[PDB]
Scaffold this motif. Sequence first.
Motif, short mmCIF file in Angstrom:
data_model
loop_
_atom_site.label_atom_id
_atom_site.label_comp_id
_atom_site.label_asym_id
_atom_site.label_seq_id
_atom_site.Cartn_x
_atom_site.Cartn_y
_atom_site.Cartn_z
N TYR A 1 0.81 -1.18 0.00
CA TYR A 1 0.00 0.00 0.00
C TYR A 1 0.84 1.22 0.00
O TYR A 1 1.91 1.24 0.60
CB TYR A 1 -0.99 0.02 1.14
N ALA A 2 0.38 2.22 -0.70
CA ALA A 2 1.08 3.44 -0.82
C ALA A 2 0.12 4.58 -0.99
O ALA A 2 -0.98 4.40 -1.55
CB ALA A 2 2.01 3.40 -2.00
N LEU A 3 0.51 5.71 -0.47
CA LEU A 3 -0.20 6.93 -0.63
C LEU A 3 0.15 7.49 -1.99
O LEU A 3 1.31 7.48 -2.37
CB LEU A 3 0.24 7.90 0.46
N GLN A 4 -0.81 7.93 -2.71
CA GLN A 4 -0.59 8.43 -4.03
C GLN A 4 -1.18 9.83 -4.13
O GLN A 4 -2.19 10.14 -3.47
CB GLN A 4 -1.31 7.53 -5.04
N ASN A 5 -0.54 10.66 -4.92
CA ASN A 5 -1.02 11.98 -5.23
C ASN A 5 -2.16 11.86 -6.23
O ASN A 5 -2.06 11.08 -7.19
CB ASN A 5 0.10 12.82 -5.87
N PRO A 6 -3.26 12.58 -6.04
CA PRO A 6 -4.42 12.51 -6.93
C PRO A 6 -4.22 13.15 -8.32
O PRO A 6 -5.00 12.88 -9.25
CB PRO A 6 -5.49 13.27 -6.17
N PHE A 7 -3.20 13.97 -8.50
CA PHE A 7 -3.05 14.64 -9.77
C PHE A 7 -1.93 14.05 -10.58
O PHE A 7 -2.08 13.74 -11.77
CB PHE A 7 -2.79 16.13 -9.62
N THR A 8 -0.83 13.86 -9.94
CA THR A 8 0.38 13.43 -10.59
C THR A 8 0.47 11.92 -10.61
O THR A 8 1.24 11.34 -11.40
CB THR A 8 1.59 13.97 -9.85
N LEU A 9 -0.33 11.30 -9.74
CA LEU A 9 -0.37 9.86 -9.56
C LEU A 9 0.94 9.34 -9.01
O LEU A 9 1.26 8.15 -9.13
CB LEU A 9 -0.77 9.13 -10.84
N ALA A 10 1.69 10.22 -8.37
CA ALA A 10 2.95 9.86 -7.78
C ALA A 10 2.74 9.22 -6.45
O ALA A 10 1.93 9.69 -5.65
CB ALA A 10 3.83 11.06 -7.62
N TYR A 11 3.44 8.16 -6.22
CA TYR A 11 3.32 7.43 -5.00
C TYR A 11 4.34 7.86 -3.99
O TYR A 11 5.43 8.32 -4.35
CB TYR A 11 3.46 5.95 -5.26
N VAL A 12 3.98 7.75 -2.76
CA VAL A 12 4.87 7.99 -1.69
C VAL A 12 5.54 6.67 -1.37
O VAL A 12 4.91 5.73 -0.86
CB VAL A 12 4.11 8.57 -0.46
N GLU A 13 6.79 6.58 -1.75
CA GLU A 13 7.59 5.40 -1.55
C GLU A 13 8.60 5.67 -0.47
O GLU A 13 9.52 4.89 -0.19
CB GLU A 13 8.24 5.05 -2.86
N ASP A 14 8.36 6.79 0.17
CA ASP A 14 9.10 7.29 1.25
C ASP A 14 8.77 6.51 2.47
O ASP A 14 7.70 5.92 2.59
CB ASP A 14 8.71 8.76 1.51
N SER A 15 9.69 6.50 3.35
CA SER A 15 9.55 5.89 4.61
C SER A 15 8.86 6.82 5.58
O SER A 15 8.06 6.40 6.42
CB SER A 15 10.89 5.48 5.10
N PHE A 16 9.15 8.07 5.44
CA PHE A 16 8.57 9.09 6.23
C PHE A 16 8.05 10.19 5.32
O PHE A 16 8.60 10.44 4.25
CB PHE A 16 9.58 9.67 7.17
N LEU A 17 7.01 10.83 5.77
CA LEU A 17 6.37 11.92 5.06
C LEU A 17 7.06 13.21 5.36
O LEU A 17 7.67 13.37 6.41
CB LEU A 17 4.92 12.02 5.50
N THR A 18 6.97 14.10 4.44
CA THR A 18 7.51 15.40 4.59
C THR A 18 6.34 16.37 4.76
O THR A 18 5.21 16.02 4.37
CB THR A 18 8.32 15.78 3.33
N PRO A 19 6.57 17.56 5.33
CA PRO A 19 5.54 18.61 5.40
C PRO A 19 5.09 18.95 3.99
O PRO A 19 3.92 19.19 3.74
CB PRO A 19 6.28 19.80 6.02
N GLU A 20 6.04 18.92 3.07
CA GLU A 20 5.81 19.19 1.67
C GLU A 20 4.81 18.19 1.06
O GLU A 20 3.93 18.60 0.30
CB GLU A 20 7.13 19.17 0.94
N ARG A 21 4.93 16.91 1.41
CA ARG A 21 4.00 15.89 0.94
C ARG A 21 2.61 16.18 1.46
O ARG A 21 1.63 16.09 0.72
CB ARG A 21 4.40 14.48 1.31
N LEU A 22 2.55 16.54 2.72
CA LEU A 22 1.30 16.86 3.38
C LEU A 22 0.66 18.06 2.74
O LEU A 22 -0.51 18.04 2.41
CB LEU A 22 1.55 17.13 4.86
N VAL A 23 1.44 19.09 2.54
CA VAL A 23 1.01 20.29 1.94
C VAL A 23 0.52 20.13 0.54
O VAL A 23 -0.56 20.64 0.18
CB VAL A 23 2.06 21.39 2.16
N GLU A 24 1.25 19.40 -0.26
CA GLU A 24 0.79 19.10 -1.58
C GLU A 24 -0.45 18.20 -1.59
O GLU A 24 -1.25 18.23 -2.54
CB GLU A 24 1.89 18.54 -2.40
N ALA A 25 -0.60 17.40 -0.57
CA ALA A 25 -1.79 16.55 -0.41
C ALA A 25 -3.02 17.30 0.09
O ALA A 25 -4.10 17.09 -0.46
CB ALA A 25 -1.51 15.33 0.42
#
Length: 107
Positions: A66-90
């Motif tokens: 399972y992975a978190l994916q961006n709704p626009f870019t369809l980019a997956y979070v393959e990161d181990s940890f989230l960034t504020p930037e990921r949150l913000v873009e989400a």
Amino acid sequence: GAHMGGSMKIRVELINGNEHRTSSTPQQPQQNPSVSHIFDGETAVKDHIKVLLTHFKIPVDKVSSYALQNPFTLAYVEDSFLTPERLVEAEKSYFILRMKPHAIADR
């Protein structure tokens, strides 16, 4: 109140039609199961995922796939940890939580 700022309560859509459990409906979701989940950069992604899975009634053993994916870019979070930037873009919209289209390796 709105939980915004650092940690974010973000709507996540979940796709899990891999397991045959839906609203007794086919693969056409009007909306997908969604949750407004507290995401932060202090908790590992997988742990956020074990929670989401659990809230969607999915075994955490699937956290692997399972992975978190961006709704626009369809980019997956393959990161181990989230960034504020990921949150913000989400927060811009939502996160998607999907089983990753990828072959399952016998790890």
